[PDB]
A paper describes a structure:
To investigate the effect of nanobodies on polymerase activity in cellular environment, we used a minireplicon luciferase-reporter assay, in which each nanobody was expressed along with polymerase subunits and NP from the 1918 pandemic influenza virus and a negative-sense vRNA encoding luciferase.
Central to the replication cycle of influenza viruses is the viral RNA-dependent RNA polymerase which transcribes and replicates the viral RNA genome. PB1 houses the polymerase active site, whereas PB2 and PA contain, respectively, cap-binding and endonuclease domains required for transcription initiation by cap-snatching. High-resolution structures of the complete viral polymerase from a number of human, avian and bat influenza A viruses, as well as influenza B, C, and D viruses have been determined. These structures have revealed that the polymerase is a highly flexible macromolecule that can assume a variety of distinct conformations, enabling the polymerase to perform both transcription and replication that require different initiation and termination mechanisms.
Numbering used by the authors:
A (entry chain F): 1 to 24, 32 to 51, 58 to 99, 113 to 124
B (entry chain A): 1 to 716
C (entry chain B): 1 to 185, 207 to 756
D (entry chain C): 1 to 249
RNA sequence: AGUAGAAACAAGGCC
RNA sequence: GGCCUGCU
């Protein structure tokens, strides 16, 4: 019943900024690096230790969208960023920081 | 509204619903709410059936995703989503395998636990009315029915709900998703009531475009359009128009009846020209027989050995020499061919076992005699256009030839008795009914009458020769083959006997069309000197091959013994029809039996025995210089048999045309003789139609002469 | 003394011995080469019988057409095609008045049939002229090729499976700028509007063989597939109409024809009092088909279909509209020979338009010179009249209208006439108080016939007193007399197969005994001769003989192996138990109780590799073209034995550029066999629907695996294997 | 198992896959009759011409694995060269006779039950009693009479549904037969032919022949009964009448 | 040459 | 010389 599509990923500079958005309940943003399983990023608010202060999660319940505003990006943020609803998971949007 | 089915539902369901849309032939642009409603019905059918599996137990195993295994059985198996033909296929198959009752309408699902059908329908209206509605639509149904409705309520008879309740929560969540999504869309101005059961269509077959213009050019001369002509026809009523044109039409258009009197019919004119020649494929009146007196039956035996044994029975062979040339060929080739045949016959006699069929060498002699490598080579027109001699095939009326007296004598002696029985009939089921006994006695009488007849001998000769020729042509297409003319008879004493008239050499017979010609060369012994009726042997080459001594009171004759050699040809159709010459017996004896039955219908008793023994009654069957001569019924049998045999031997288009156009005049003459005031519209036309069939065929000319004689004797 | 069979007629009346005048024991005449000469002669003759008409040039086909309708009235007794529209409309109106409700009813049933008819009905036909290849091919093949071309061009309404939709697509094809066809030598060729119009309006001409009763050969025609549906509907209407007319005799058999002839003669003569004289005319119509203008058939049908739905009128009118513009292919061509250079050549007929005339004789030269103006794209326009009895039933309707127009209510005179009409032949009984009355009646009948484009052959017709006449080789002399010479050619081996030939021969003997008054002894002789010919044809001799053949060894060992040798079939070298009492019993059942169980089981074994059954229509139906008649089919009683094999096919396709047709045949047959194994009722009832093959086959595989597990051999392992194999073929069809 | 397997094998090759995909069910008949073989104009001529060849008949491929390629003396029985437009192979007529002397044997006890019409004819004739032949003119008048003596009072279409439900119970479709006569006929011919393995098509054809009424116009004199018309050739003639009473009466 | 009769056969095509 | 077809 809940389909999800992520937007706003891509190639970015180190120290640059990126606004992920997921069009579709509580919502989460999770990430997967090429050599690992799922990592918690944010939920809606709470953020993981590796991304706190840099990244902000927000939602518009009238647009049915959850946003992840990433700033001051690091090469270690390079991952597929997946949106999730709470059992329902997006396909993920590639973010590559360099 | 269609944007909703663009957006939400998966492809699979939308094209399933589109094919269901095409099923009953209505268009989607006029009313789409039906599409959405039935696609939601189909969706609930899937979502209710899938995700539900069973194992060897009952108690369905429910898995969110079917794992790789043999355990992929589906709890509910879908009915709809298929064509009507297949839906009823599944219905009937389930009924015949489950032993359940066949519903009259379409169900939606089948289940094992309860071994029965489910007809799922989710309607806009509340359940507690739609349920019993569809229930009274379905007669005396044991298939359990279960329906939802948008408010979220469920119901069913027996208070029965056949599977998990979380699935039903799924169903109603799906349901209210639909509902409060149209809420964003806004369709209930018609969603509750959008279909009322409309079924109507008008068939449209419109003439337009080019095909209309063609219709405008297929009218009477003074009409401009199909519309105007149809309007005129609809407005047309009979007002005496045939009478006006009949009065205005010229009076020279008439069908005046010319009276037909005794002095009206004139004798048919026969063509004039060189005498008529012989056309038969074998000698009929001038045949000679070399015999062995063996006990073998017709088909029993081997041809070559029998022929050699028969020929060794004759002594007095002389070196062959020309007596009467072909007048158009190379007679030395015929002489050399005869000597070659003799030499190769001896060659077979020497070796171990006589071969069943022999092939001959392809020498220049038989290459010429059989017409080999004479067909012009086929080429293309673009390469042969400047050749002055290049023209059509010769296509003109055949050469004209006048009748000769030899065909009359040949027919005369074709109806004469013989000293042998030339028919050995097959077996039939033993007669059980008295009518069968009467039939058998009649048949025995006719066989006794016709077996000793030259017509039967000709029938057997033709049948055997054509059968052998066809079989050899079909088997040995390439190589020249030797076939001795063999016919087996039975003497008065009862001893069986074989007879060898001569030999046939078949040539290349690559026959594709029914008209393609296979050429052969025929050699036949005889004693009739060809120096007395040369015009009858225009196409024959006749040699002198020996002397024969037949016991006669005048010392012993020591007659000459000649060989008639000629090049002839046939075709697949001719061979097939000549191998069915035995139906001449039928034709003739059917005619005689019709005579007997017609006469016996007068006197209430079978009249066969007295007809065949007393011989009191006689029919006109020929004319002598003294007058018309009548013969017994047996002579009529033989005469009709000979007529049929000659029809089968000298068959040609001339014969058919003359037969038809002379049967017409015969019927007219019969009407005259019956005092029925016959009349004709154009008798000269009929006469010209008859006279154009008489060109060169001896048989048709003889028939025309017979017709003239019949007219002369009739009309008195 | 000189023997003369004809003198036999001096004692036996002509009709009581008419069988002697039928030389049907020899080979019938056959044509040998091209039929182009006959086609050209027929075209010229049809055009010159209507010379006084008016000429026009069609704006679509660009061909010259001659319209004689409403032309000058004839002033001579020569054949004339100048039919008058008003006269024929009045004749049809009188026909309706004498038979109220005929047209409306017949149109109602025809409308039902047309709107419920299917496309497959067109496959039930003999050779048809396929325009995709410009040659005659079996009806099914031509229909399939045309459907394929239409679907490739974008005309897919025929997918509805309705013949009316197929005709809609056919007409829509007429308005297309450019169609595409396929040719093998594959090459895609483009046909413009006019070329396709002429290819759809053309006819293929051939020479008729095995035609007994005339010295000269004739030409016959075969139409295409675009026009056969309209012809089918028109002939359905005409048959429904004629079935309501007792004066017609075309849609019935022979015995019904005789019964109606007897009834009409008795009615005419019996009602006639002593004062009225009666005369029978045994009339034949000269150039029947060449003088019947399709425009007049259009007029007749549009009068018949008055006050009917316009679509019905249009669909029934399309056919005569196309016949009025019909074209005829000249034929195979002409073959030339050069003896000086010793060669031969074959020029196609399409070159007759431009080829010089130095190669042709005077007659052919003049024929070509006269027909050239009508040559358009290798085919000649034949608007003036029908070619060969395509509208038999409508012609019979016109003749019946003429016959009924003299019911004494329209004659307005003492004389009157009636009779029976079957296209190209008629018997006319005319009564009148005096010979002058009879003469006037016959004269007026002839004149009225000439006003409808129908001519009476004065050379092949004669009039006598009633009680003696002829009709279609049936000779009536105070009662019909049997002939038995017309059925003589049917007394041999038919040529289907062993069991079929045996059953057909015995059944033919039986029927000719019932109908054609064949005698008992004659029937026994026929049985004996047929058995002899059958054994000599199939190399199946009695077995106890020493006749060495290619099949005499196995037969002899079977003979020596069998204990009760009386049960062996004649096909296997056994005795013949047939007789007059057993002519209605199949051979297998007559010898069933005498066969040994081993031989009986070996013979009638379903697993035999010889028996092959295709459809319900071709189970025990044999098509025997009767002598002096159209092709006919017969039901023959036979038991499916090992002798029911089907013979070898032609096999000459392998040397032609059309060699890929055999591969397509094999693939289609493989798919059809697979479908039949999936759908057992495919043969008995032809399946219907709009889905595709693989959908039905895969879905039925699903269900049948399911249920045959729910009871049967299948197992879970196999059922799941089938389910996932179905999924595999599904994803394969995806890609 | 097998059936879907040759289905998959067919779909493997592109041409047959296209034929299966684009061809609709309705066109089934057309493509099934799609053939280059013309219908013979003169069957007798060619049957008399073909039988003189070696390998003149045709048989299924399976013959190559039931009958040896040659007999005792070496006369060939079958060839491996296939027919023109079929997978069947051309074989000699001896392969027929061979099959009747050493071919596989079965139990033909049920053929009498299938071919009911012909065996009923045989039984009727076997117990018939003939009588004296009376010679007198017969006034043959032409009448419409029923030839089939076992017709169950059903038309072609009327009995076609019965035949399908008896043989093809699953392809019946909408129709469920209402008339109880049809019910009893279905029951009887279902329990009687429950395992007969002759062929579905021939069984259906013979059921159609037996149950469907058929009528033809014939010249008759007396009789007029169905049983008396099948022997019309034996009881009535041009000038003779043969009294007969079939075994049924 | 021969068959046959309003046009054909008296082998065809492919290498 | 070798091979193919015999209503296409």
């Amino acid at each position: 019943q809940v389909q999800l599509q992520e937007s706003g990923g891509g190639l970015v500079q180190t120290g640059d900024s990126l606004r992920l958005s997921c069009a579709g309940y509580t919502m989460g943003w999770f990430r997967q690096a090429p050599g690992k399983e799922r990592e918690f990023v944010a939920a809606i608010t709470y953020y993981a230790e590796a991304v706190k202060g840099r990244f902000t999660i927000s939602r518009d319940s009238g647009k049915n969208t959850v946003y992840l505003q990433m700033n001051s990006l690091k090469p270690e943020d390079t991952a597929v960023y997946y949106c999730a609803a709470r059992s329902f998971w997006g396909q993920g949007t590639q973010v590559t920081v360099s | 509204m269609e944007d909703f089915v663009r957006q939400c539902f998966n492809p699979m369901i939308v094209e399933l619903a589109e094919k269901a849309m095409k099923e009953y032939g209505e268009d989607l642009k006029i009313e789409t709410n039906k599409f959405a409603a039935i696609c939601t019905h189909l969706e609930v059918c899937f979502m209710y059936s899938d995700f539900h599996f069973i194992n060897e137990r009952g108690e369905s195993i429910i898995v969110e995703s079917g794992d790789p295994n043999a355990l992929l059985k589906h709890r509910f198996e879908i009915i709809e989503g298929r064509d009507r033909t297949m839906a009823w296929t599944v219905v009937n198959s389930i009924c015949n395998t489950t032993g359940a009752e066949k519903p009259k309408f379409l169900p939606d699902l089948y289940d094992y636990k309860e071994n029965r059908f489910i007809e799922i329908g989710v309607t806009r209206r509340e359940v507690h009315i739609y349920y019993l509605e569809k229930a009274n639509k379905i007669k005396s149904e044991k298939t359990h029915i279960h329906i939802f409705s948008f408010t979220g309520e469920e119901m069913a008879t027996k208070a029965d709900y056949t599977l998990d309740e979380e699935s039903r929560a799924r169903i109603k969540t799906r349901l209210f998703t639909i509902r409060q999504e149209m809420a964003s869309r806004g369709l209930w101005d018609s969603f509750r009531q959008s279909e009322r059961g409309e079924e109507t269509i008008e068939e449209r077959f419109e003439i337009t475009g080019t095909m209309r213009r063609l219709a405008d050019q297929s009218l009477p001369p003074n009409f401009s359009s199909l519309e105007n002509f149809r309007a005129y026809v609809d407005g047309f009523e009979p007002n005496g128009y045939i009478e006006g044109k009949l009065s205005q039409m010229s009076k020279e258009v008439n069908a005046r009846i010319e009276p037909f009197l005794k002095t009206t019919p004139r004798p048919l004119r026969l063509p004039d020209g060189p005498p008529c020649s012989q056309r038969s494929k074998f000698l009929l009146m001038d045949a000679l027989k070399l015999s062995i007196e063996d006990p073998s039956h017709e088909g029993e035996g081997i041809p070559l050995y029998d022929a050699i044994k028969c020929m060794r029975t004759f002594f007095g062979w002389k070196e062959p020499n020309v007596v009467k040339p072909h007048e158009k060929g190379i007679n030395p080739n015929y002489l050399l061919a005869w000597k070659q045949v003799l030499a190769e016959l001896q060659d077979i006699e020497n070796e171990e076992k006589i071969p069943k069929t022999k092939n001959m060498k392809k020498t220049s002699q038989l290459k010429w005699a059989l017409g080999e490598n004479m067909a012009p080579e086929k080429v293309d027109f673009d390469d042969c256009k400047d050749v002055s001699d290049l023209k059509q095939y010769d296509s003109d009326e055949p050469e004209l030839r006048s009748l000769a007296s030899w065909i009359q004598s040949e027919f005369n002696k074709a109806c004469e008795l013989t000293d042998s029985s030339w028919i050995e009939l097959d077996e039939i089921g033993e007669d059980v009914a008295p009518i069968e006994h009467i039939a058998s006695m009649r048949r025995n009488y006719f066989t006794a009458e016709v077996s000793h007849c030259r017509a039967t001998e000709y029938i057997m000769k033709g049948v055997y020769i054509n059968t052998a020729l066809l079989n050899a042509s079909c088997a040995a297409m390439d190589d020249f083959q030797l076939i001795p003319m063999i016919s087996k008879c039975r003497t008065k004493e009862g001893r069986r006997k074989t007879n060898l008239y001569g030999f046939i050499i078949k040539g290349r017979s690559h026959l594709r069309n029914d008209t393609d010609v296979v050429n052969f060369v025929s050699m036949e012994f005889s004693l009739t000197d060809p120096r007395l009726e040369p015009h009858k042997w225009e196409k024959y080459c006749v040699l002198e091959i020996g002397d024969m001594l037949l016991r006669s009171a005048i010392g012993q004759v020591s007659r000459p013994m000649f060989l008639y050699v000629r090049t002839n040809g046939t075709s697949k159709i001719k061979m097939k029809w000549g191998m069915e010459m035995r139906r001449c017996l039928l034709q003739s004896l059917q005619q005689i039996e019709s005579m007997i039955e017609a006469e016996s219908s007068v006197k209430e008793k079978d009249m066969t025995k007295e007809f065949f023994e007393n011989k009191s009654e006689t029919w006109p069957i020929g004319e002598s210089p003294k007058g018309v001569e009548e013969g017994s019924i047996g002579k009529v049998c033989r005469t009709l048999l000979a007529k049929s045999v000659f029809n089968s031997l000298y068959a040609s288009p001339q014969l058919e045309g003359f037969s038809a156009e002379s049967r017409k005049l015969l019927l007219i003459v019969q009407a005259l003789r019956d005092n029925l005031e016959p009349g004709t519209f154009d008798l000269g036309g009929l006469y010209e139609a008859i006279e154009e069939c008489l060109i060169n065929d001896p048989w048709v000319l003889l028939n025309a002469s017979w017709f003239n004689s019949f007219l002369t004797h009739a009309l008195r | 003394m000189d023997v003369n069979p004809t003198l036999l007629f001096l004692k036996v009346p002509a009709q009581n011995a008419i069988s002697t005048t039928f030389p049907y024991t020899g080979d019938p005449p056959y044509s040998h080469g091209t039929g182009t000469g006959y086609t050209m002669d027929t075209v010229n003759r049809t055009h010159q019988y209507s010379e006084k008409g008016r000429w026009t040039t069609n704006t679509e086909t660009g061909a010259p057409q001659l319209n004689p309708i409403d032309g000058p009235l004839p002033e001579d007794n020569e054949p004339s095609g100048y039919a008058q529209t008003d006269c024929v409309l009045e004749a049809m109106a009188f026909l309706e008045e004498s038979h109220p409700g005929i047209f409306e009813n017949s149109c109602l049933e025809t409308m039902e049939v047309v709107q419920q008819t299917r496309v497959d009905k067109l496959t039930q036909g003999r050779q048809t002229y396929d325009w995709t290849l410009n040659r005659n091919q079996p009806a099914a093949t031509a229909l399939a090729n045309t459907i394929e071309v239409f679907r490739s061009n974008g005309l897919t309404a025929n997918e509805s499976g309705r013949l009316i939709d197929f005709l809609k697509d056919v007409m829509e094809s007429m308005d297309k700028e450019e169609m595409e066809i396929t040719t093998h030598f594959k090459k895609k060729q483009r046909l413009n509007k006019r070329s396709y119009l002429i290819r759809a309006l053309t006819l293929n001409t051939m020479t008729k063989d095995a035609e007994r009763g005339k010295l000269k050969r004739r030409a016959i025609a075969t139409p295409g597939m675009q026009i056969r549906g309209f012809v089918y509907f028109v002939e359905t209407l005409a048959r429904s109409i004629c079935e309501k007319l007792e004066q017609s005799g075309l849609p019935v058999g022979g015995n019904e024809k005789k019964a109606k002839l007897a009834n009409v003669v008795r009615k005419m003569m019996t009602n006639s009092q002593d004062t009225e004289l009666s005369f029978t005319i045994t009339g034949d119509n000269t150039k029947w088909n060449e003088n019947q203008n399709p425009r007049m058939f259009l007029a007749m049908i549009t009068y018949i279909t008055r006050n009917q739905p316009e679509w019905f009128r249009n669909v029934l009118s399309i056919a005569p509209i196309m016949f009025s513009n019909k074209m005829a292919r000249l034929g195979k061509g002409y073959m030339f020979e050069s003896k000086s250079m010793k060669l031969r050549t074959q020029i196609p007929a399409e070159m007759l338009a431009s080829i010089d005339l130095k190669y042709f004789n005077d007659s052919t030269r003049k024929k070509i010179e006269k027909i050239r103006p009508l040559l358009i794209d290798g085919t000649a326009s034949l608007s003036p009249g029908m070619m060969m009895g395509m509208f038999n039933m409508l012609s019979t309707v016109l003749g019946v209208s003429i016959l009924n127009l003299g019911q004494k209510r329209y004659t307005k005179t003492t004389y009157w006439w009636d009779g029976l009409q079957s296209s190209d032949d008629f018997a006319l009984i005319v009564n009148a108080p005096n010979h002058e009355g009879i003469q006037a009646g016959v004269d007026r009948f002839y004149r009225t016939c000439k006003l409808l484009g129908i001519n009476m052959s004065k050379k092949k017709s004669y009039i006598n007193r009633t009680g003696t006449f002829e009709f279609t080789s049936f000779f009536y002399r105070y009662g019909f007399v049997a002939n038995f010479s017309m059925e003589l050619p049917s007394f041999g081996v038919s040529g289907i197969n062993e069991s079929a030939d045996m059953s057909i021969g015995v059944t033919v003997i039986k029927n000719n005994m019932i109908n054609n008054d064949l005698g008992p002894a004659t029937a026994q002789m026929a049985l004996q001769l047929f058995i002899k010919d059958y054994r000599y044809t199939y190399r199946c001799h009695r077995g106890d003989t020493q006749i060495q053949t290619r099949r005499s060894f196995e037969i002899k060992k079977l003979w020596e192996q069998t204990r009760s040798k009386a049960g062996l079939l004649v096909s296997d070298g056994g005795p013949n138990l047939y007789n007059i009492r057993n002519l209605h019993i199949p051979e297998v059942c007559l010898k069933w109780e005498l066969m040994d169980e081993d031989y009986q089981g070996r013979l009638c074994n379903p697993l035999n590799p010889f028996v092959s059954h295709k459809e319900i229509e071709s189970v025990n139906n044999a098509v025997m073209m009767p002598a002096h008649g159209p092709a006919k089919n017969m039901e023959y009683d036979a038991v499916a034995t090992t002798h029911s094999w089907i013979p070898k096919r032609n096999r000459s396709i392998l040397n032609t550029s059309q060699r890929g047709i055999l591969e397509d045949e094999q693939m289609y047959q493989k798919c059809c066999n697979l479908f039949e194994k999936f759908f057992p009722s495919s043969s008995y009832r032809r399946p219907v629907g709009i889905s595709s093959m693989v959908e039905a086959m895969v879905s039925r595989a699903r269900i049948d695996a399911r249920i045959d597990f729910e009871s049967g051999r299948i197992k879970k392992e196999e059922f799941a294997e089938i389910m996932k194999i179905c999924s595999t073929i599904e994803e394969l069809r995806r890609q | 198992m097998e059936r879907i397997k040759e289905l998959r094998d067919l779909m493997s090759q592109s041409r047959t896959r296209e034929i299966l995909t684009k061809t609709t069910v309705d066109h089934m008949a057309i493509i099934k009759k799609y053939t280059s073989g013309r219908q013979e104009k003169n069957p007798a001529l060619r049957m008399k011409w073909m039988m003189a060849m070696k390998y003149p008949i045709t048989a299924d491929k399976r013959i190559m694995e039931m009958i040896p390629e040659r007999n005792e003396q070496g006369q060939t029985l079958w060839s491996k060269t296939n027919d023109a437009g079929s997978d069947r192979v051309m074989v000699s007529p001896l392969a027929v006779t061979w099959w009747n002397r050493n071919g596989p044997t079965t139990s033909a006890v049920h053929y009498p039950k299938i071919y009911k019409t012909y065996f009923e004819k045989v039984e009727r004739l076997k117990h018939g009693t003939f009588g004296p032949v009376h010679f007198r003119n017969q006034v043959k008048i032409r009448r419409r009479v029923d030839i089939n003596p076992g017709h169950a009072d059903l038309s072609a279409k009327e009995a076609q549904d019965v035949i399908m439900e008896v043989v093809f119970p699953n392809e019946v479709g909408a129709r469920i037969l209402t008339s109880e006569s049809q019910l009893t006929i279905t029951k009887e011919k279902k329990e009687e032919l429950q395992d007969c393995k002759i062929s579905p098509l021939m069984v259906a054809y013979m059921l159609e022949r037996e149950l469907v009424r058929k009528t033809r116009f014939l010249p008759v004199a007396g009789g007029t009964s169905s049983v008396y018309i099948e022997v019309l050739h034996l009881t009535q003639g041009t000038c003779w009448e043969q009294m007969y009473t079939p075994g049924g009466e």
